């Protein structure tokens, strides 16, 4: 499946693009289901998790009665989830933009992050975009530059950078 987006350059250039994950690590999609050792059924099988009091007690703590927190040096700060979700970084939805250009030799293979390779073309039914991307490819090959680009899958994903 393609990634239908629009590459943005400055504030006056946009090219409808479709990205394909050319490389994807193999991974099984069939999980293992624990069933009974006697009836061989999962119906009689389901977890029981208990938030028993960590202090000198054993009383379970209800889901709402318990919150998260984060270690801070020598202590831990009490923390909710509404607080972070209203003070988290807000990504600008699904977007993908270029940032700069540099020589190919300025980077090495040992700085290649992620677990997938994205082969990207323009969106379907835009032959002018095809000519534009072809010119981009030719110019980049001639100049031997590499484009520095910023990626963002969607609002709820983490924006990041790429080459």
């Amino acid at each position: 499946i393609h990634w239908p987006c629009r590459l943005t350059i400055g504030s006056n250039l946009s090219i409808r693009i479709a990205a394909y994950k050319s490389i994807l690590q193999e991974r099984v999609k069939k999980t293992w289901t624990v069933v009974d050792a006697k009836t061989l059924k999962k119906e009689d099988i389901q977890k029981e998790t208990v938030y028993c009091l960590n202090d000198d007690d054993e009383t379970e703590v209800l889901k709402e009665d318990i919150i998260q927190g984060f270690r801070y040096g020598s202590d831990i700060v009490p923390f909710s989830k509404v607080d972070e979700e209203q003070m988290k970084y807000k990504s600008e939805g699904k977007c993908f933009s270029v940032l700069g250009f540099c020589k190919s030799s300025q980077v090495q293979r040992r700085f290649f992050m992620g677990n997938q390779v994205l082969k990207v073309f323009a969106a379907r039914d835009d032959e002018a975009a095809a000519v534009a991307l072809s010119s981009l490819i030719h110019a980049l090959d001639d100049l031997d530059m590499v484009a520095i680009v910023r990626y963002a899958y969607d609002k709820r994903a983490n924006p990041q950078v790429g080459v």
Binding site: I67, P78, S80, V82, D83, Q86, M87
Partner: protein, 246 residues
């Protein structure tokens, strides 16, 4: 303990950082048996906020609890009893509390069943920012309505700011863009600011008050303008200028 009323009610004591620190305030709360919770729960009646924190900012965002300043609880402890929740310790509150305050009070600190006093009226007036954007004629009309409708016609001072008087303040008439010096026009111009009776310096058909200014040489102009209108100018008989409206 001291007062069981403060007990049985959960209090989110999370910002006791005041001139009185948090620990001693919490100790006093325990002395009154007030129920202390660190994080705001549904059973918690109100959240104790002293100084401002980013956590308090989120509490403002979280329209779930009522932000309470230490003044209200301090007065409660001094009185050993709950102090009424008039908005002077208030920052952010539940919509249920919003309706409660809109019921027991108006859109401000004024009450509906408790007679106003100097303190609450002054606090309400000082809480609202400056709102001078209307025309001076609207000011004159509204203050005149306040005076006449409410039997408020007892103002000790009334010269020219407020309602229904006429007086010439310029030697030259129909040309008010220039000021004549070396005369009493400046004194009248000064008097036309403070005490209050609306200023009129233009000649029109809507004037029915016969007034002679501090200059006795303007009577010729007054009589010249008298024939232009139906009104007849009469010789004048507090105001401290010896004027009569008839």
């Amino acid at each position: 303990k001291i007062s069981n009323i403060f007990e049985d009610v959960e209090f989110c004591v999370m910002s006791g950082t005041d001139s009185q620190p948090k620990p001693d305030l919490e100790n006093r709360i325990a002395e009154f048996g007030g129920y202390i919770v660190q994080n705001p729960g549904p059973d918690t009646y109100c959240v104790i906020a002293g100084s401002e924190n980013i956590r308090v900012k989120n509490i403002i965002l979280s329209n779930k609890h009522d932000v309470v300043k230490p003044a209200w609880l301090l007065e409660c402890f001094k009185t050993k009893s709950f102090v009424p929740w008039q908005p002077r310790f208030m920052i952010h509150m539940c919509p249920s509390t919003k309706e409660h305050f809109a019921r027991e009070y108006d859109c401000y600190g004024d009450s509906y069943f408790i007679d106003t006093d100097l303190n609450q009226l002054k606090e309400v007036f000082s809480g609202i920012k400056n709102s001078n954007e209307q025309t001076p004629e609207e000011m004159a009309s509204l203050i005149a309505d306040l005076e006449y409708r409410y039997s408020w016609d007892c103002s000790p001072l009334s010269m020219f700011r407020r309602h229904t008087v006429y007086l010439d303040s310029y030697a030259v008439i129909n040309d008010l863009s220039t000021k004549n010096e070396g005369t009493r026009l400046a004194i009248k111009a000064l008097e036309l600011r403070f005490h209050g009776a609306k200023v009129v310096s233009c000649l029109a058909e809507g004037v029915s008050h016969v007034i002679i200014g501090e200059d006795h040489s303007r009577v010729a102009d007054f009589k010249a303008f008298r024939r232009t209108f139906k009104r007849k100018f009469k010789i004048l008989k507090d105001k401290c200028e010896l004027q009569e409206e008839n």
